[PDB]
């Protein structure tokens, strides 16, 4: 599905009915192997190299992740591999994204892919929940939150903003997850709000954790009438 020709003072590389890459050359295409085109100058072979990054993006234009990997695999930058890998991850092509990240060897998103496969196994299928997790790891928080809402799980958007400590956004979504882990986490986040001086959040968390003397002492020491 990829070919090369020469004519009119140009070399022309064309992939799979997409637009054609044109650059100046004189001489003729004799053959084409891997990333190299064996163009012949007026007395000797010259071995021009293909911009593999360009046809790879032409497959990503069309969300053809499975085909884009075949252009990438002949040789592209770690930038090209990472761009392919996150396009496949957001396209929910986890078999391509797994391999596109193995080339970069980025364990963060391999752990996420292993989680999503460990939830497709054991009978989850909600794609909007999977895209919300990908947008959460990418820091695409407002888009992750809309997906956590629309996937039917507003409490996951409450947790994400509560954990990042975005309090006004958290007040709109209020609820709780697993109460033991929630109480431990609220205790640790109260201690953060105490130690790093955001202590009004510590006061509300210590009140909801049941510790009124610590709350009155913190309010009395910080001056909240």
């Amino acid at each position: 599905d990829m070919l090369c020709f020469s004519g009119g003072g140009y070399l022309n590389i064309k992939a799979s009915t997409f637009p054609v890459h044109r650059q100046k050359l004189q001489g003729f295409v004799v053959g084409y192997n891997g990333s190299k085109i064996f163009c012949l100058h007026v007395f000797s072979i010259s071995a021009v190299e293909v911009p593999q990054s360009a046809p790879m993006y032409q497959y990503l234009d069309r969300k053809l992740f499975k085909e884009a990997y075949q252009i990438a695999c002949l040789g592209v930058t770690d930038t090209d591999w990472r761009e392919l890998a996150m396009e496949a991850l957001e396209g929910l092509d986890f078999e391509t994204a797994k391999k596109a990240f193995i080339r970069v060897q980025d364990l963060r998103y391999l752990e996420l892919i292993s989680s999503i496969e460990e939830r497709k196994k054991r009978g989850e299928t909600n794609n909007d929940l999977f895209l919300a997790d990908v947008f959460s790891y990418q820091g695409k928080f407002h888009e992750a939150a809309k997906l956590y809402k629309r996937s039917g799980h507003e409490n996951l958007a409450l947790e994400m903003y509560t954990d990042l400590c975005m309090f006004e956004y958290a007040k709109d979504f209020l609820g709780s997850g697993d109460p033991k882990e929630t109480k431990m986490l609220i205790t640790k986040q109260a201690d953060w709000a105490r130690n790093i001086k955001e202590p009004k959040a510590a006061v509300e968390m210590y009140i909801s954790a049941g510790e009124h003397v610590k709350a009155i002492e913190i309010c009395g020491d910080h001056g909240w009438v």
Binding site: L164, C165, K188, N195
Partner: peptide, 10 residues
């Protein structure tokens, strides 16, 4: 946890 919160690393 606090250090990851201060640089927004989810």
């Amino acid at each position: 946890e606090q250090a990851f919160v201060r640089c927004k690393d989810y």
